[PDB]
């Protein structure tokens, strides 16, 4: 809800089982690989954000929350050193974990698509007034500058 | 109601008995044929949507819900590869399952008819503010481009 | 009331005793004759609507409801094949079934009369905001094009 | 909340364990050093405010409150004798004491940064209407005139 | 609060221990000296108001109330015979009696200072809408015409 | 309060002990003298109002009510035969009967003074919206035409 | 109160003791004389209204009601045959029956006086919004055309 | 233009060559037949208006004016004795006398059609604000009650 | 300009050299073929509109006017018998006859495209307020129902 | 000015001397190279737009107009096949051809930078209301997706 | 005036006699020294802006224009590499070249002072609506970060 | 008039005959004494403003302008080192040089008096919208802090 | 007219023949007596204003102007030492010098009378917007405090 109560990615206490991906870094497994080791809210180190090797168009990233909550809004950031940013994407939400739905608003009578940002210092937010009763959220970035890299930060009620 | 709580067609758990039609694909039966096998909310495969062979003007498609609910609004999509879209249609609603009524609004003092869409990327919605206490809903498309094909998605309260 | 809860004429379960008229088709009786056999909400067949032989000016049609309810609004349609429509009429309402009253509004400081429609596709409604606590309703059409024929559809609260 | 109920730094009863820093004045310890001895709300003496020797860009100052409260607003002052003031900074807030978050508002669709002040007599406040449910607050001053020196004063609900 | 319920200085029943000062008139003590003997709301006699010998810039005057109350507003007067008035001052408020805070408003984004008055007949009030939950109040007059002399009159809720 | 419930001076049942003055008519006493004998709300006789011999500037007139009430508003009249009216005055109110306070409003940022009237037929009222929780009320007329004479009439809630 | 619930003068059941006057018609008594015998709300007969012989300026007419009620408003009429009407008057109200008060409004900052009427057919009313908690009401007509004659009609809540 | 300056059909001075039709009454000619003999603005006689024998759908009636003028608005009437009125029609205008154009407005984003009237006493006008620079005007009535009969009356600027 | 002064296609006096196309009907030439023989504003006959054989996406149709004029607005129609309508198109304009420009509006901050119509009876106009100083105009229909067929009608100032 | 009168790049009549660049394609010269041969308003062929080999940050492109005119607004497009678009740029204008100025608006109290577009179909315009009296205009694109490619189109008054 | 017509410092054609200063770089003279050699609107080289050695508080810089013009507005920039910016200053204007006046606005009822900027990328302008008929303009910067350095740019009408 | 065109006191070219006073500094004369030698718009030196020895209440200072002009507005300043400011004064204006008039405004229905200032840095102006057609202007300061000292600056049209 | 152009009474150049009165001071004449010798706009001396011996109710004072002008507005003052002021008066104006008219406004639907003032310091003006084309003006003061004394000051256009 319209409040300042974001999630806790910088804490790191969350197990890597929730952050599921498909980018084996050292053929260790298939569940996770990058997890929250080098992709947190402002974390100094080698990897400032989550990088991507293969140019996968239908990219996804599971985000398992603690329970079902009303998510509204999401921050936007970039990547230091090598500037990287997205251009087009779409939010998703599910419940039974056996489908994939696209986020559509009421004031969009055309093929409008979310923007995002274009600078690491910019903080172009997207206030989602329509309450969304869901839990899992994913992003389908259709384009990017060089590589997908953004320090996401969902907002819970 | 004005919320984001659509049905679950992509799940596929619903039995094909609810999705009744009259288009025998391989003379298997008369109840259903295409069902939700190749007609869901974004499903990659051979059949991206529900096709139609015979040019049936008075087309219908039973949609049996779980129970009586207040339906308001409906999404609009197209078909990939071969672009297809409707032009005119009319929503229906019943209760005793022994009649067929047409959807008429209060701010329509003429022979106005719903539009729909004209592009797979477009998402021209139709916010139906007037609450409709019903369960079964059908569509009577009077025209089309080449063949009837649209990934419908009702909205429940 | 301002809602979408019309009556059920297409069902046909209602007995013909309620739909009383005075047009013996085959000298069978005097109570009813045409009833809801060829006059329902969109019913394919020979008689698309209720026809009239004699040019009766003071025409009436009893409509016995289930119980006393607040009626507000009424749909308007025409007749296929042979276009037919009314021009002037007046709504009535009673209680003790031993009188006949005319419908008069508050914002009518003259001899104004309801219109109706002039096309089978048109749906010129008449939103009657003033609540009317009654049960039986009749119409007194003073004119017509060739023959009285309209698929009425009262609205209950 | 929008009220006049600031903290109590001038009292001095608070122990130096809360005011943690990293500026050993006489190699006494590492926890605190300057504490509230020469940095209070208007305190006559040698040190009118908290000075800084090394030009540390990522400066921080722990402020442990009594309990979790809704902080909103903050005063701004300068330094006597030698005029000193900041130019850019960012408010932070945490809960589990194992992360660091940046303060972002809803009406900031760009890389906007808080100002502060530029005179010891000026009192340019920053009314933070959005409630912030937190406890620990820190500042990340990115620039200054000569040395970081400001008599801060948080506001609790 | 916005009401007409001022304190009772003209009564004189209050003991001189509350009105603390530092102006020995006849080296009698250090606690009080002038008290409410020649400084009340319109009191005919020798001393029409409270005079000041030494030109003390950081002047103070303790005002111990009965209990903690919401003070809002304060009257302004002058001195007869020899016209005297202030120019700049600042209201203060404390609780633990071990600090001194300055009064700052929300609609003051600069180094604004209260005015006061400039005539014994004038009654330029200062409606302080923001509730102030305090008890002890003092004034820090930075300037004056010849000598500090004003018949103050706090307003309690 | 804003109502029509004035006091009862014309009744005369009130004892003269309440109406205290200092104008011995026949050296009878010092408490009262004129009382409500020749000064009431429209009373035909010799003395149409309360006259004054000595030109006393700091004139007062005790008005002891039944109990503490919220007084708001006051009528204004003149004197027949010999026209007399005031020009400047000030309302007062007390509680402990051991002080004297002046009436000051919130919308008076100057040395404004009440007017009154200037004709026996005129009825220039002064609606005092700010509630005044008091009991005793007095007037300090600073000027007059020839002699102080006015048929006052307080208003109680 | 603003309603249509006038008194009952036309009934005549009220005893003549309430309608007190001072106009002996046949030296019968001093209490009443004309009473409601020839002065009611539209009463055909000899005396259409209440006449007056002597040109009494300070005219009065006691009107004893059943109990204390909130009176608001009063009708105005004339006299048939010989047209008669007033020009100036004043309403009065009392409680203890031992005084006489004049009716003064809040929006009258001058010597304004009520009008009344100037035609038997006219019905110039005077909506008295300010509630008046009283019982006895009288009129002090200061002028007239030839003789005082008006069919009054108080309004009770 | 918005003024009261209609044409002169009742005068009859205009020759029948302008009023061209195709309804030989007595096989006299082909140019005109009924002309303005029994079709004028209120003309008592046998033919109250212009009748029509054959049920011609694409009916036309040439109206040659004196010169090119700005026509705006048109009256609407009926027929006495036997009530007759139209239902749908369309205005036309040309210049070179070698084409036929239909009248379309700017605020008609659908298949709207002009109404007309439905009573000889009614005078439902159609204020055509958009100036129309033309001369010849015709009507294409698509429907009627029994026979086409209306006393038209163009309006010139 | 916002007026009713369309072109003259129904006249037919224009030579076929202006209406240039590339659809040889009987290998007669390459300049024109269909011209205004079976494509005019409502012309009864075999060809009700201009048909198209090959499914040419980048379709064009030269329209040489008399001189340079300010064109604003354009009508929209359909085709009888076999219903046909467009879906997407774009207006063009040139001057030197050696280029091709696309029509872009000021209130279109996206990839918006003109609609057109979807019924022969509908008249969905497109009021082009922005003046366009040009002469030649063409259309680039990107889609259609079955075949391109529309009775265009430009509007000149 | 706010009108539809763009330049003429598609004509090609302009000599290559005006379009100056610094990208020798075949070491032919230093003045121009790509010119308007493969970079015009929608020109089918090999090069759909102007490509760039070296990743030059301070890119420039001289645009010599016919004379000094008031330029306002500019279109935005993309590149087919390989999608390419800019992210940040700045407009410039000069007069004496011996300097370079940056375009700054009045409603930009920060480091705001123009956007542009992000799709070949999009037409995100930038209405520059402030008149700019200049002739030569250049762009300083600071970023891009892969290569600088955009079909610019200035707007003259 | 509110237009885009700045001066021409980047041209360099202006002689150094106009840009008078008092900072001998190599004891060459006293008139000028730095001039427009290393202080222009964006000029790549060693000196990006005008530096200052001595910490002169009452700094001045003569700016002789071509003639008397109405100056309104002024741009604000910073310095690359080493960030430098001002904090307080005051605009001046003269005519006879024998005095120095300070710039005071009408909506400044206090000791307000202009700000400027605090970033090389920021462009915080100061729209001076009040016309100023003058020629010579100077700045009196009272403070700075390290050294005075700003690429000024006056605006002429 | 509302413009920035003050007089020229800093120039000093004006002869001392215009600045007439009555404060012989060294018994040199009676016309002038201090003149514009140590009283100009910001002039560094011994006397920062015009001082006053004797406490003259009815102080005056002739200001002979070049000719009759419309004066509107006046600046307000203080004195450095020793802070001095006025409290009450009144503007005057004459024509025949044989009288003295006081400045009275239209929106002053009381004994209001101009304020001035109370700080050398403050610039509390007094916009005099009412045009004043005069030439000579003087001030009658009724009070001051210690000595009359203010750097006046009239404003001419 | 609404401007600052009063008459010139302080000059004294006007002859005493214009200021006609009827108060022989030393039986010198009958025309004038007090004239402008001791009654001017602020004139120090014995007589601060014009006194009156006999209590003349119908007082008059001729004021012969230079010519006919539009008079609007008039100042109001008092008398020093002995405070004196009026209460009621009426302005007059004539032309042929053979009559006397009273000043009546349009927004006075009652017996309203001008007030004036009640303090020498007050300046209660009376803006007379209605233009008055006259020359001679007089005042008819009906009341006063002790003696008629006021320093009048007419306002000419």
Residue numbers in the entry:
A (entry chain H), B (entry chain A), C (entry chain B), D (entry chain G), E (entry chain F), F (entry chain E), ...: 63 to 219
What sentences appear in the manuscript?
Retinoschisin, an octameric retinal-specific protein, is essential for retinal architecture with mutations causing X-linked retinoschisis (XLRS), a monogenic form of macular degeneration. Retinoschisin, a 24kDa protein secreted by photoreceptors, consists of a retinoschisin (Rs1) domain and a discoidin domain with a small C-terminal extension. Uniquely, the cysteine rich Rs1 domain and the C-terminal extension in retinoschisin mediate the formation of a C59-C223 disulfide linkage which is essential for octamerisation. Retinoschisin forms a dimer of octamers with each octameric ring adopting a planar propeller structure.
Previously, the disease-causing R141H mutation was found to be secreted as an octamer at similar levels to wild-type retinoschisin. R141H also formed octamer and dimer of octamer species, with imaging under cryo-EM conditions confirming a similar double-stack arrangement to the wild-type. Moreover, the increased number of side views allowed for 3D reconstruction of the R141H complex at the higher resolution of 4.2Å. This revealed a comparable domain arrangement to the wild-type protein. A homology model of the R141H discoidin domain was constructed and fitted to the map using DockEM. As previously observed, the central density represented the flexible N-terminal Rs1 domains which were masked out in the refinement procedure. Comparison of the R141H hexadecamer structure to the wild-type retinoschisin map filtered at 5Å with DockEM, revealed a highly similar structure. Mapping of the R141H mutation indicated that it was located in a spike region distinct from intra- and inter-octamer interfaces with an overall positive charge. Comparison of the intrinsic fluorescence of wild-type and R141H mutant retinoschisin showed increased fluorescence in the mutant despite the lack of gross conformational change, suggesting a small change in the spike regions. The disulfide-linkage between spikes 3 and 2 (10) could act to propagate a conformational change in spike 3 to spike 2, generating a wider subtle reorganization of the spikes at the propeller tips.
